[PDB]
Amino acid sequence: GTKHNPLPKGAEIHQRAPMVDEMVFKTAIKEPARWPERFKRVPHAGMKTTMT
Amino acid sequence: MREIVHMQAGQCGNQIGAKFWEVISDEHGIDPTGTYHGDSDLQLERINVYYNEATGGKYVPRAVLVDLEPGTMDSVRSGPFGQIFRPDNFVFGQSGAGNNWAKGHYTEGAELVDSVLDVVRKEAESCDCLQGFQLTHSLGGGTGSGMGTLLISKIREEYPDRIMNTFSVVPSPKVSDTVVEPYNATLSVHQLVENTDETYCIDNEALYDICFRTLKLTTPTYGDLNHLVSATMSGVTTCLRFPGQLNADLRKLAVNMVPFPRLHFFMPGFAPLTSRGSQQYRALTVPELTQQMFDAKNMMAACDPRHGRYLTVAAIFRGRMSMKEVDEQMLNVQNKNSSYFVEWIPNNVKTAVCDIPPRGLKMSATFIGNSTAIQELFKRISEQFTAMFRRKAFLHWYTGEGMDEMEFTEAESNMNDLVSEYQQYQDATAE
Amino acid sequence: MREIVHMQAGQCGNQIGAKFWEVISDEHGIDPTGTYHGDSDLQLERINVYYNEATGGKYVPRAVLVDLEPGTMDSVRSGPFGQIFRPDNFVFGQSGAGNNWAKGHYTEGAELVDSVLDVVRKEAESCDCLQGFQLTHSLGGGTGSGMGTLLISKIREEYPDRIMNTFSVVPSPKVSDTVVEPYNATLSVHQLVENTDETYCIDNEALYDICFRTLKLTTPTYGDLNHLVSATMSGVTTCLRFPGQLNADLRKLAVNMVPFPRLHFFMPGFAPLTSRGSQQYRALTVPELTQQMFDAKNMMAACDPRHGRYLTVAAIFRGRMSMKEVDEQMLNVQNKNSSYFVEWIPNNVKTAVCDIPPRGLKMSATFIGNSTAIQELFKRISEQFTAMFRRKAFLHWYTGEGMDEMEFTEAESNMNDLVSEYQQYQDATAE
Amino acid sequence: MRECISIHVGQAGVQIGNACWELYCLEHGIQPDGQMPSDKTIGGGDDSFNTFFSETGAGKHVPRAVFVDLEPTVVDEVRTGTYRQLFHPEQLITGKEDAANNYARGHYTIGKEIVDLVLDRIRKLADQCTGLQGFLIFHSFGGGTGSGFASLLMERLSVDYGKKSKLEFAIYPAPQISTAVVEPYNTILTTHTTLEHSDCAFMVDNEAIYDICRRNLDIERPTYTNLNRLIAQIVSSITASLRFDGALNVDLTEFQTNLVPYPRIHFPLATYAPVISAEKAYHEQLSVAEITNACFEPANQMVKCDPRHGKYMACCMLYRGDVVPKDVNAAIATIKTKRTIQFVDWCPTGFKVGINYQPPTVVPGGDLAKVQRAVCMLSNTTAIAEAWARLDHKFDLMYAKRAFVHWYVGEGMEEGEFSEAREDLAALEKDYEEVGV
Amino acid sequence: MRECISIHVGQAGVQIGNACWELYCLEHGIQPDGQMPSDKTIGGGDDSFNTFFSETGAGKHVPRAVFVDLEPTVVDEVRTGTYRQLFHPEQLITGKEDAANNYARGHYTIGKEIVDLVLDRIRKLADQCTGLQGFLIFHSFGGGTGSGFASLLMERLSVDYGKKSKLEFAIYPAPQISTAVVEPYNTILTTHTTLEHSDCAFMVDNEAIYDICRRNLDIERPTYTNLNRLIAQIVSSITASLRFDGALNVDLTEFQTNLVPYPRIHFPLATYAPVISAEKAYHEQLSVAEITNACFEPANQMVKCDPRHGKYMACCMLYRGDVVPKDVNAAIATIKTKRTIQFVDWCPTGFKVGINYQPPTVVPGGDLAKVQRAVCMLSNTTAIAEAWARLDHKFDLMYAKRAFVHWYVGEGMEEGEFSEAREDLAALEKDYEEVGV
Amino acid sequence: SNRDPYPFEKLENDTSFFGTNETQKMPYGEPTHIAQTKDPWQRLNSTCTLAS
Amino acid sequence: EWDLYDPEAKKKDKPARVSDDDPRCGPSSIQKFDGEDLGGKERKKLMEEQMREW
Ligand SMILES: Nc1nc2c(ncn2[C@@H]2O[C@H](COP(=O)(O)OP(=O)(O)OP(=O)(O)O)[C@@H](O)[C@H]2O)c(=O)[nH]1
Ligand SMILES: Nc1nc2c(ncn2[C@@H]2O[C@H](COP(=O)(O)OP(=O)(O)OP(=O)(O)O)[C@@H](O)[C@H]2O)c(=O)[nH]1
Ligand SMILES: Nc1nc2c(ncn2[C@@H]2O[C@H](COP(=O)(O)OP(=O)(O)O)[C@@H](O)[C@H]2O)c(=O)[nH]1
Ligand SMILES: Nc1nc2c(ncn2[C@@H]2O[C@H](COP(=O)(O)OP(=O)(O)O)[C@@H](O)[C@H]2O)c(=O)[nH]1
Ligand SMILES: [Mg+2]
Ligand SMILES: [Mg+2]
């Protein structure tokens, strides 16, 4: 073909953070993401088993 | 041990289970990235009921996502906790159910059922002590009414003794939203009554009324409805997932709520529910929880328990309370209005008190009732079915796919048999 | 120190060997020039199995590349990792094959057989305890079928006590790259039955299946198809090159998977194999490797393992792992899928365990199966042969180069005899 | 992954295609030379154009439409105007002689010269598809290319693409306003290709759209451009659920299964609300209750026909914009309680709702105001038999004198076509009467 | 070193050679003076020329061709044109008088004077080579030197060289278009050498290439230059598997073995079909499925006979460029599951797929668009018997009352030769129809 | 075979437009040598061109 | 042998591949194939531009 590679194999920019398949997951996620709200637990009856 | 395989069929089941996984991961401390960042070891000791351990702190839910259209896959990946699911469990066909029970069951659901059974066998043979299969779906559609009941069938006659429960968003005359809802519901209730073990029977009308009247909520939308349903699904298994004074898992619930095998159609209810205007007028007590459970407006089914008789009642309380107060508050609600309970089942109330309330709540309580008022929903579906089937309206769509009208005849007749069975078992005397 | 000499016949066999030698060189630390640049001392301990020590730190692969057209030899000689082979094993003609089994077996190719046997005898004399011969070639082509089968016949005649294994890329009726594939495959299978010791059937349709529905891969081309076969070859041969708790050479595999002499057509597999999205959700353990290894969507033959009975199964594991969980997984698969395992052979599964994983992995597995479902592929090839043989189409090419129709009839009769033998031992009862 | 193939036949089909593809280019943000810039498509995915447009090898987008006409006038208007580089030159097929308001000329003489070419182009546009929702055939009943050649094309499409759905949008003649003398003959002759070769037939009426643009858009002299823009709004609202994301998404198969009760009964009435103007949009709050009550009024219908004397058999609500699925249920409850909508006895639940979260786009130089919410109402009603009875009366008025028959007989049509077509339409309106009772 | 000798007989052969060696030089970087700079060579080419051109050891790349024509007009136009210094002077061979559309004057008189000189030049070009794959013979059936002298020459190559493969790119008379009167006689008389002195006999029809040029490349007025450029593109796409790398690259005898089922059946059709103008290529993907369906579309064939009236027997695809096999397999599956493409029952698998890693080169001033993917499909169908029967009837209408026979009789060629050629034509036709049934 | 060697995105086809046209397999009929001894295939295999 | 039956063995483990440029993934671990067209988007864009200019 061409004598010089138009896009050399070493000069590629891979994605970065979590790699995802584009074959089954067509839409991409722009991910600074909103996590849901966290109800603060009740401070004295949150995790206290009746045994303890 | 005591593993549960979750399955969500159709758009409604997918959205409801997505809210369910948000609620469950919030309760267990799982981050939206999938890692565990909780505060106590009680969130980690029973994590294997719904989750699989991966490398690091990753937890993958044991859920199978089925729908016949690819748009639901985008709609369920658009949510928070959308990347926690394994991509191998995203089993989606490239077509669309078209609100057709025959499409979902006989033509294109048959091409997807082998792959869904393969991935459920994947999620089932990895469990050492697999307990049951839960399915969330909606009767009235094409995948929940069709593919969902087909999945119920193959999972049943592959696993005999495992506890099957379906949550079953049944249609309603007032919400409507679909003309062929009577056909889909009538064709699906036949597979519901023969191949399941606990059917929970939610509908959108009672969900709107709950989100509408005791919560105000000027814009009710669908997320709040799925939140209520998800809270109920968490409350029916909090005794399985957390230590408590009285433990009752799904097997004990099926023992204590099913007198006869074709009587497993329950009505749910979850009752620390008040509006934010009424929020500061509360006492926050076990009698308040029990009373707002047994109030005949917080039922997630439009059936009125006053127009019926309670065969069995299950109450799963959650938090730090006293057994004396719990037993007194579920004994006086038999002694006062004993006329709404069956005489031939004495003390027909089973209580299960856990010790870890949901995150942010002091006390919560889940109500399950096997009342004989489910015949109201079934009779409304039948009276809407027998108007269409008399003139055979919209029948060519179903019968051009190999289906016969004798199948509709069986669906209507066996549903009438279920209605008559419920009426006989509510009008039967002691002796 | 049991030496194995490699043969690469045809374009497909040469490219498969090209991938095989670079995966072996990455496992054993040899760079493309030939120098050992590894770190562990266990790499340069059994290097004499595949590598002959030249002057200095140079290690020449013990491989013979055979072709008739110079194109594939020029490709493998000018491509990356192509200067490690000795430039006297590149034996080729100047004419072509024309996808003609007669041009591979009787003329053109038969003139090169003396030179190929010369260089093969030199490479065999270079050994001390040569265990056997390995061949990579494709049925359905030219020199891959005819010249490969002639080489197998001559080597079996010269050394009739050595383990001969072929890797036999069989044609598929769904990829369909050549019209005369039924003739070449039918004439080559007949030679493969009575000459080789074991034959690992490779199918391009199943390779594309495991490239598309397992690894996604978008555009897989031939590189991935050769990579999978090369990894399977390394996983088969790892017990001669690295130590372990439970070792098994090729003769052990042949003894424990060949019940009757005309039963050696195998179904290979390799099963750490997951896509980019599912890397993080997959946890690499022995039950996961066992499940993917016994999955029907992971075989490299076009068979359905659930369409027949597994006569023998062998799994070669690699890595630090529990022999207890390895054994109970190899037994658990039998107890669940006991209907797909034949009854008159109790515990159909052989276990080999090596303690050295492939470079970059912590554990790996390799499947070799002798199921009675390879009669499906043989029946497809036989029916295509008789369909284009009833009208004697494309037969003047084969009969104008010294081949009678008696050879065609004998090949068809013997291959149907092989199919009938597989069907008989599938349908054979216990007692 | 979804695609719909548009076939625009006739002059009315070509002009409706011009307005319709202007609307689609505005909706998907494609410039008239064919390039989509910035590829965001707010309220939808990246592939949201794939229903109507296809990528090329040069990064351009070409529509999945075929504009066929037997006359080189309107096709050359398309090939000369602003949307010149957007269309593939092979997609715009034209003849030499038009059918000249003659069903026989369009069906037996001139149509059997480019029927093979239009089928080949349809085959290419269907082979370049990955999921095919169906075909959208835009034509007029007024005669000629839109009746005879459309009949031939749909007869070939029904035997080739048997499984695929075939929606059609047909311009139906008015009770009084009309522009052709032989158009009762053409309309009677073209009933068979709409009864045995169509899966759903949206019939629009020029007089009804004239009255809508007169009393609602506040313009005294509307024209065919205005009519075609309002017609294109219907199909944009129909395919909104396929293109953009929403709460309740209804594709064409779910649409047909929830709309048509019987295979012969596939003729609904279309309406749109609001069709309000910019100055009138100042003075009322356009909410779900108002737009639903406007859709059921017997003045916003797009066939000159009173549905209060008929019975609604099924209705498809298609909401588009600032719509929450509880206001929908409130409006449906109010409609079910109010009297003039009388539903047929065999349809208890008579509504199918599709809610989309994308407000309709405004076309510059247009008349429709930019609105928060809109709704397209598609109702199968037993009242279209009034229009077909008017057509039968106008056809039997001339067939008794046997006027304008020598043209059809000379061009090749046997005289039994008129008799069997009038018999077919009489039996069909008898079928609607029997379904209604 | 996979050399092939190109022999161009007649004016139609010589003009194809002019349009073909231009493409070969511009593909391999050969200047018209005979040097490779470095730039115009394929990357990694180096010796990739060494199947069409030969080094002299100093830099000169002499083509491996013999241009023959009894008339000294067009060959001296070659000698005067831009490739004046490219060709060896002995490679371009002329007589004094042309055969004047007479098979007798091409085969028995006149043409029996330089056939030995042409054979000596062919022998020199043959023993200059080391790996001679075969001979590609370009001529026409219009008459004279392209029929009689090409018959004599290809006969003597058949009896001399033997095992070398003799491809024929013959130009066939059209069903209706013809530039001469005695073409039926000159085409009947030469079927023996295409029948028993050729290993493969690809045929092209000038009217079919005219129709392809008018529909696809938008040339309303094409000519022999465009026709010969398309033919040269076909031959380049055939031979590139001998020149450049590819995955399943074929070597002449490979697709002969995968193409001809029987020795008498070696007359396939050759369709190069990403054939399109640049303006129309701006609006399509030109993907693998598109360029595969365009081959089986029965309007892109270079012989005027649609294969829908016959059955396919062996299709060899020769793909060029960025064509991954994963798309070629899907295209082959779509072709197999097509309705109208019917394969013969005794050929279950009938696709010889070959891929080359080299996109087509484009000539400046050319009419084809610069695509990156190409298909040359060679298909053996039972539909060339239509052209055989058209030739047969046009021959019988003349031989019924013996028109123009005295010209053939007075120059050798006893009267029974016409009947013998007619009889073997009928035998070949019978063979094709009995294979088709 | 249930193995799918084709990519995920498959273009439409006659099997999706009209329907699946696969028919059945005829039982076998005459045996192989009787089928070989039919006239217009045995004649073609027997008669060979000079080039062949 | 505590590394082989540690209860937190999955807690203290790395999946197989982590990222697109894992040093572990070579030609033997076969978690890195050349078929994954990670530069395929840029190559496709180059082809669109090149067809456009042609
Ligand atoms: N709504 C609308 N209707 C149109 C338009 N153009 C034409 N029509 C309708 O078309 C009818 C006239 O017949 P045509 O559609 O022009 O006939 P044709 O399809 O071009 O076929 P030929 O008569 O052979 O040319 C009129 O009654 C109009 O109702 C338009 O732009 N908008
Ligand atoms: N495609 C194509 N065909 C040509 C060309 N030149 C001539 N022909 C064909 O050749 C036929 C006429 O016969 P010729 O080839 O000229 O005869 P000849 O081989 O030169 O021998 P003479 O009769 O002595 O001139 C015409 O019917 C054309 O179809 C050309 O440049 N391109
Ligand atoms: N509670 C609840 N109901 C829903 C939801 N989505 C849809 N529905 C109801 O389900 C009915 C339609 O079911 P559908 O989703 O189409 O089922 P499918 O076709 O199998 O996916 C409608 O009448 C809705 O009222 C949801 O997220 N929550
Ligand atoms: N897996 C794989 N198959 C190949 C490769 N090259 C060719 N094939 C297959 O081998 C068959 C042709 O065999 P071939 O290599 O030409 O044999 P030869 O004629 O002796 O060179 C074709 O059907 C291809 O599908 C390769 O690199 N990998
Ligand atoms: Mg007109
Ligand atoms: Mg001349």
Coordinates of N, CA and C in Angstrom, one line a residue, chain E residues 229-283:
Chain E
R229 N -11.2 1.2 -20.7 CA -10.8 1.5 -19.3 C -11.5 0.5 -18.3
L230 N -12.8 0.3 -18.5 CA -13.5 -0.6 -17.7 C -13.0 -2.0 -17.8
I231 N -12.7 -2.5 -19.1 CA -12.1 -3.8 -19.3 C -10.7 -3.9 -18.6
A232 N -9.9 -2.9 -18.7 CA -8.6 -2.9 -18.1 C -8.7 -2.9 -16.6
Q233 N -9.7 -2.3 -16.0 CA -10.0 -2.4 -14.6 C -10.3 -3.8 -14.2
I234 N -11.1 -4.5 -15.0 CA -11.5 -5.9 -14.8 C -10.2 -6.8 -14.7
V235 N -9.4 -6.6 -15.7 CA -8.2 -7.4 -15.9 C -7.2 -7.1 -14.7
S236 N -7.1 -5.9 -14.3 CA -6.2 -5.5 -13.2 C -6.7 -6.1 -11.9
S237 N -8.0 -6.1 -11.7 CA -8.6 -6.7 -10.5 C -8.5 -8.2 -10.5
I238 N -8.5 -8.8 -11.7 CA -8.2 -10.2 -11.8 C -6.8 -10.6 -11.4
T239 N -5.8 -9.8 -12.0 CA -4.4 -10.2 -11.9 C -3.7 -9.7 -10.6
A240 N -4.3 -8.7 -9.9 CA -3.7 -8.2 -8.7 C -3.4 -9.2 -7.6
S241 N -4.1 -10.4 -7.6 CA -3.8 -11.4 -6.7 C -2.5 -12.1 -7.1
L242 N -1.9 -11.9 -8.3 CA -0.6 -12.4 -8.6 C 0.5 -11.3 -8.3
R243 N 0.1 -10.1 -8.0 CA 1.0 -9.0 -7.9 C 1.2 -8.6 -6.4
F244 N 0.2 -8.3 -5.7 CA 0.3 -7.8 -4.3 C -0.1 -8.8 -3.3
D245 N 0.0 -8.5 -2.0 CA -0.4 -9.4 -1.0 C -1.9 -9.4 -0.8
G246 N -2.4 -10.5 -0.2 CA -3.8 -10.7 0.2 C -3.9 -11.9 1.1
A247 N -5.1 -12.0 1.6 CA -5.3 -13.2 2.5 C -5.5 -14.5 1.8
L248 N -6.6 -14.6 1.1 CA -6.9 -15.7 0.2 C -6.6 -15.4 -1.3
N249 N -5.4 -15.0 -1.6 CA -5.1 -14.6 -3.0 C -5.1 -15.8 -3.9
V250 N -5.6 -15.6 -5.1 CA -5.8 -16.7 -6.1 C -4.7 -16.6 -7.1
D251 N -4.4 -17.7 -7.8 CA -3.3 -17.8 -8.8 C -3.8 -18.5 -10.0
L252 N -4.5 -17.7 -10.9 CA -5.1 -18.2 -12.2 C -5.7 -19.5 -12.1
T253 N -4.9 -20.6 -12.0 CA -5.4 -22.0 -12.0 C -6.3 -22.2 -10.8
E254 N -6.1 -21.4 -9.7 CA -7.0 -21.5 -8.5 C -8.4 -21.2 -8.9
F255 N -8.7 -20.1 -9.5 CA -10.1 -19.8 -9.8 C -10.5 -20.5 -11.1
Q256 N -9.6 -21.0 -11.9 CA -10.1 -22.0 -13.0 C -10.6 -23.2 -12.4
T257 N -9.9 -23.8 -11.4 CA -10.4 -25.0 -10.7 C -11.6 -24.8 -9.9
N258 N -11.8 -23.6 -9.3 CA -13.0 -23.3 -8.6 C -14.1 -22.7 -9.4
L259 N -13.8 -22.5 -10.7 CA -14.8 -21.9 -11.6 C -15.4 -22.9 -12.6
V260 N -14.6 -23.6 -13.4 CA -15.1 -24.5 -14.4 C -15.5 -25.8 -13.8
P261 N -16.7 -26.3 -14.0 CA -17.1 -27.6 -13.4 C -16.7 -28.7 -14.4
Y262 N -16.8 -28.4 -15.7 CA -16.5 -29.3 -16.8 C -15.7 -28.7 -17.8
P263 N -14.9 -29.4 -18.6 CA -14.0 -28.8 -19.6 C -14.7 -28.0 -20.7
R264 N -15.9 -28.4 -21.0 CA -16.7 -27.7 -22.1 C -17.3 -26.4 -21.5
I265 N -17.4 -26.2 -20.2 CA -18.0 -25.1 -19.6 C -16.9 -24.2 -19.1
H266 N -16.5 -23.2 -19.9 CA -15.5 -22.3 -19.5 C -15.8 -20.9 -20.0
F267 N -17.0 -20.5 -20.0 CA -17.5 -19.2 -20.5 C -18.2 -18.5 -19.4
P268 N -17.5 -17.8 -18.5 CA -18.2 -17.1 -17.4 C -18.4 -15.6 -17.7
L269 N -19.1 -14.9 -16.8 CA -19.3 -13.5 -16.9 C -18.4 -12.8 -15.9
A270 N -17.9 -11.6 -16.2 CA -17.0 -10.9 -15.4 C -17.6 -9.5 -15.1
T271 N -17.8 -9.2 -13.8 CA -18.4 -8.0 -13.4 C -17.6 -7.3 -12.3
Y272 N -16.9 -6.2 -12.7 CA -16.3 -5.3 -11.8 C -17.4 -4.3 -11.3
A273 N -17.7 -4.3 -10.0 CA -18.9 -3.5 -9.7 C -18.9 -2.6 -8.4
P274 N -17.8 -1.9 -8.1 CA -18.0 -0.5 -7.6 C -18.0 0.5 -8.6
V275 N -18.7 0.3 -9.7 CA -18.6 1.2 -10.9 C -19.6 2.3 -10.7
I276 N -19.1 3.6 -10.6 CA -19.8 4.7 -10.2 C -19.0 6.0 -10.5
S277 N -19.7 7.1 -10.8 CA -19.1 8.4 -10.9 C -18.8 9.0 -9.5
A278 N -18.0 10.0 -9.5 CA -17.6 10.6 -8.2 C -18.8 11.3 -7.5
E279 N -19.6 12.0 -8.3 CA -20.8 12.7 -7.7 C -21.7 11.8 -7.1
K280 N -22.0 10.6 -7.8 CA -22.9 9.6 -7.2 C -22.2 8.8 -6.1
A281 N -20.9 8.7 -6.1 CA -20.1 8.0 -5.0 C -20.1 8.9 -3.8
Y282 N -20.3 10.2 -3.9 CA -20.4 11.1 -2.8 C -21.6 10.8 -1.9
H283 N -22.6 10.1 -2.4 CA -23.8 9.8 -1.6 C -24.1 8.4 -1.3

